[PDB]
Structure 1
Amino acid sequence: QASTFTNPVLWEDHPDLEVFRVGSVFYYSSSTFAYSPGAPVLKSYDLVHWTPVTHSVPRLNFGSNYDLPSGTPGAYVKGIWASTLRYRRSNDRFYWYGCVEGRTYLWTSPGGNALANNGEVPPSAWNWQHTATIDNCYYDAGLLIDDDDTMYIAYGNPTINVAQLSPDGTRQVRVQQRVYAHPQGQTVEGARMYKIRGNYYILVTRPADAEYVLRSTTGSPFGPYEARTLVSRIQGPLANAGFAHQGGIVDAPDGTWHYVAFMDAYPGGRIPVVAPLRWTADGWPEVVTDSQGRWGTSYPIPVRGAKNATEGLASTDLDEFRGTRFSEHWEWNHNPDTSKFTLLGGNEGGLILRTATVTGDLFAARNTLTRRIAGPKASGIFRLDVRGMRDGDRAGAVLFRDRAAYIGVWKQGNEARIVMVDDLRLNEDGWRTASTGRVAANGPVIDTNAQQDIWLRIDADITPAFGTNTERTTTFYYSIDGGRTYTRLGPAFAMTNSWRYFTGYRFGVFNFSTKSLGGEVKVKGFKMNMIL
């Protein structure tokens, strides 16, 4: 058995993390902006091996922009920002709170008696429902369920506030403003709140390079709070990925604490790293560094020999869209038009994407289905049947972000042709479309037999390059011999290192029309291979 682990623990974009433990299970909640479903939950038995198990927000309920009714700016880079999740033992219910455009939304799910089953939730038990809307802006919320079952939320920017909730968690009953302000006027945010051995602690970030630990000086959850540095511009564990910051702390079954932070590993996104904590005699947590004062590239494993938790498909497992619902790896760009896709299900599987939007702009198209890229290098392959495309349809495999490119098929009259398109751009100023794309290369006309089984492959390099002037490249390929041989199409595509869109690069499949609705493609399957 492995006795150590290496950082990062998961090389996939899961930002604004919250972590906690129920029995033997660790849970991890991340932010997802306008991707739908939102607010994924991952589980691990050891803080190292994570698997996605549910989403707290099955359809984004924050207004009609989230349905992408009429093109950009839609709700791009709005939606779910840093939010919070905890498990309530007393009623066996998970509570997810997230502030979206000035209001805070509560989504809850029963836990299938998790408290009594060592923290396990049966897959069939998850059932997330919109439970309340609180008309308070809990920006960068951190929920605490206190030992007496009173619920508190720390929040704010650039100073921290603490609100007390009603017993059912649906309204605010008390608030203390400005429980912490930095004495040199520095901005703090990213609150996570804890009750630990009789005391209240709040973890906050100084964006985007430091984490401070606050502790209540009075013993009251309303503070006031004083601060110590947890990390500040710490080196490691990865180069060209900004600094470890934000995240949260959690204890293992053996009682040892750990700090789970994330790095700005653009162009891949923001990815978790883990370090042990020790506690000073006066009750402050400190990061255990390597012998050189760095966040270690490797540490002892927090929990040893724990079977991984194969609850559904792994990130790199072939997915032929079998059974009743999407695996937890998939999220749509904005809420999907549910009338325009079909998960066929059963042993054969297959996903039908009927065109949902008439547009010349990929960023305006409904029903683009996306998933995270695993780093540092990965190949995403989609296998399609495109015989059902109609005149004016465009469909394919997209490397999806604010600067995007795809390999796809364009159906014009009775001609289906493979194309590579680049220069698909959203303006960072307001997220309106800047460019609807350039056909960088034409591939072959494909006959009906090739249309029946076309494989489109994206080789993405997400090796961190944040804060450098080196842009990583992605290359595109197609196969019309059943995935045996691939042909490179088009130039290498340079990827942006910008943080402004927040979400990392993703693999996606899209299908829209420039002329009229009616056509469809079938996605037979997707596979991600790690490029070693």
Structure 2
Amino acid sequence: HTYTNPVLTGFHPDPSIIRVGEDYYMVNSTFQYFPAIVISHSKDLVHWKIIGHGITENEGLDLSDINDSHGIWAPDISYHNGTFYIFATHRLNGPTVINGRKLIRRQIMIKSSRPEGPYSKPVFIDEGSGIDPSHFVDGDGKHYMLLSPACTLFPLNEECTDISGEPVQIWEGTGRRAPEGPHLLKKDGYYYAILAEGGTGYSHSITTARSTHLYGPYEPCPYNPILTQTDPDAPIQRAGHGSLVETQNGEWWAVYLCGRPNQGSYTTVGRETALDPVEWTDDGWFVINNLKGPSLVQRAPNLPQVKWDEKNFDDFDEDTLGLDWQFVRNPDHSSWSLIERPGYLRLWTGDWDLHDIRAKNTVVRREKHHLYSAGVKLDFSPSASGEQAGIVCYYSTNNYLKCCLIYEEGLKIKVVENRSGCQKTLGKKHAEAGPLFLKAVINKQKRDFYYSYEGKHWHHAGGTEDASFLSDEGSRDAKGHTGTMVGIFANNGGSGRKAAADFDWFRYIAY
């Protein structure tokens, strides 16, 4: 078998992976999205399925006022003596006084006896000096937390709820920018230190060092960088922030984040998770894909192939939300339901439009292709100015593209962009009453919306020939760490009314 990178497509940055027996588990950062920290499962390292999230209860983490691309950053999953641990940085909006100390970051620790959870309520380790916490357990069973800058080693208590001693920077890195995502690996009598360097942009790389002692000194790998993209014309870029795993058949593999530039330097679907083999060298080191950079097509891992149901069609006939969905920030559980009208995802119209950080219950999934369509069947009866419901391609509060049934002096199908903070109506068509179908068609950076009354004859509502603002780089946001998502929303245009927008189904089609 062969596979083509990325193996986990769409918004899946900062991968951290473990193997427990025949099962592989991976976590990715979620930033302002809820539930926080997506957890995925695989048997073959190629095909991945979402099985849960680390933080699922609103009482565990308040993202309701967290700024775009702040919140939950690079997570780290580990397993030790029957306990699954997840650490992650929680990035605050700015300087915040917590129990007397001023911080812009907090570290989170959750744990569980099961990979999918439910995990313990988040415990905060208030070490604000760096990002990307990484759990390491030495041969003597002592627990440690690695943290940026570079490899800064903190001792932890046995429960991993607090730091038990002074930190030491055991390796400073290579001198590249923003040394982060530190990891430690113990093999062949060495401690191997792994870093992401160059920043998560187009200079991203992976560098390593080794020492016979936990606290050093560490010598740099002569093959640094052991993974990076040196070819600017390649369709995969921004390769770095890796995590290593050994299979039950003795092969070594690395997952890492990357980006797929979409008609220019635009990471439309956000940073994704790629896979490439790790080769150990006869002089005591390891490299990734023989220093060739990220592969576009690669020999599959020596593991039995197991594909999963992708759930591209959601008819909403289960009383629990599918695990591929995310809320933009914490859900308002009073204003969405799968049980008030079985067979429908109901959104009661919230008070705020998508550009407002206070907007609740935008429900979206990851874009996994640059050629796809997404459609819904909607039952909605707006009766006052601004009451609206429909579909949205969402990057941030300043960057989205929505198509909705709206009341604006009668029923209308309306297409609106927010282009880096600039709102523009792209199209507005007369709408008839009754059940309605809406369809988003994405072809690279061209996006268009269509409506239909019976799902057979489609009429253009509006679109743009330049969707590059839906990307990390095109967003022009202060931080662009997420990815374009696609889904549904409803709000009352400020009327105050609670109106039921009933979505019969959502359908995603890669073409």
Relative to the length of structure 1, the TM-score reads 0.83
Q: Counterpart of 2:343 in 1: which secondary structure?
A: coil
Structure 1, residues 83-110: CA drift from partner, whole Å, max 9, x if none? 211122x2x2211111213221212222
Change (3 A) 1:193 1:341: same
Distance 1:306 1:383 in 2: 35
Q: Counterpart of 1:83 in 2: which secondary structure?
A: strand
Post-superposition offset of 1:457:
1.1
Q: Counterpart of 2:331 in 1: which secondary structure?
A: coil
Distance 1:360 1:177 in 2: 44
Structure 1, residues 201-225: CA drift from partner, whole Å, max 9, x if none? 22111124343443442422x3332
2:85 to 95, 112, 115: 95
Post-superposition offset of 1:512:
0.9
1:6 to 4, 17, 29: 4
2:476 maps to what in 1?
Answer: none
Distance 1:412 1:36 in 2: 32
1:104 maps to what in 2?
Answer: 107
Change (3 A) 1:185 1:397: closer
1:454 equivalenced with 2:436 (yes/no): yes
2:245 maps to what in 1?
Answer: 250
1:517 maps to what in 2?
Answer: 497
Distance 2:503 2:256 in 1: 36
The aligned runs of 1:35-434 (5 Å cut-off) are 35-59=33-57, 66-68=63-65, 74-88=66-80, 90=81, 92-100=82-90, 101=92, 102-111=105-114, 126-137=117-128, 138-157=130-149, 159-182=150-173, 184=175, 186-206=177-197, 207-208=199-200, 209-220=203-214, 222-228=215-221, 229-231=224-226, 233-235=228-230, 239-265=234-260, 266-289=267-290, 293-308=292-307, 310=308, 313-316=309-312, 318-344=313-339, 348-358=342-352, 361=355, 364-387=358-381, 391-402=385-396, 403-412=399-408, 415-422=410-417, 424-426=418-420, 434=421
Distance 2:451 2:253 in 1: 44
Distance 1:410 1:224 in 2: 64
1:480 equivalenced with 2:447 (yes/no): no
CA contact (8 A) 1:341 1:354 kept: yes
Post-superposition offset of 1:236:
6.4
Change (3 A) 1:461 1:196: farther
Change (3 A) 1:213 1:395: same
Post-superposition offset of 1:269:
1.0
CA contact (8 A) 1:477 1:488 kept: yes
Structure 1, residues 372-410: CA drift from partner, whole Å, max 9, x if none? 001132111122111366553121101111422111111
Structure 1, residues 161-194: CA drift from partner, whole Å, max 9, x if none? 0112111111111243221123546431122232
Post-superposition offset of 1:511:
0.7
Change (3 A) 1:461 1:283: farther
2:100 maps to what in 1?
Answer: none
- The number of aligned residues is 476
Give the letter for the 1:409 counterpart: L
Distance 1:529 1:454 in 2: 19
Post-superposition offset of 1:197:
3.6
Distance 1:456 1:485 in 2: 11
Structure 1, residues 113-154: CA drift from partner, whole Å, max 9, x if none? xxxxxxxx6x7xx31221522121351122223444322221
Distance 1:46 1:131 in 2: 31
Distance 1:212 1:518 in 2: 50
1:444 maps to what in 2?
Answer: 430
Structure 1, residues 344-363: CA drift from partner, whole Å, max 9, x if none? 289x5211111222458455
Change (3 A) 1:355 1:505: same
Distance 2:67 2:76 in 1: 21
Give the letter for the 2:406 counterpart: W
Relative to the length of structure 2, the TM-score reads 0.86
Distance 2:354 2:55 in 1: 30
CA contact (8 A) 2:211 2:217 kept: yes
Change (3 A) 1:184 1:521: closer
Distance 2:240 2:41 in 1: 21
Give percent identity, aligned residues only: 23
CA contact (8 A) 2:227 2:288 kept: no
CA contact (8 A) 1:237 1:296 kept: no
**Two-structure CA RMSD over aligned residues (Å):** 2.5
Q: Counterpart of 1:491 in 2: which secondary structure?
A: strand
Change (3 A) 1:39 1:147: same
2:486 to 507, 516, 525: 507
Distance 1:48 1:389 in 2: 48
Change (3 A) 1:324 1:407: same
Structure 1, residues 417-462: CA drift from partner, whole Å, max 9, x if none? 111112x145xxxxxxx33x32221122212x3xxx2111112245
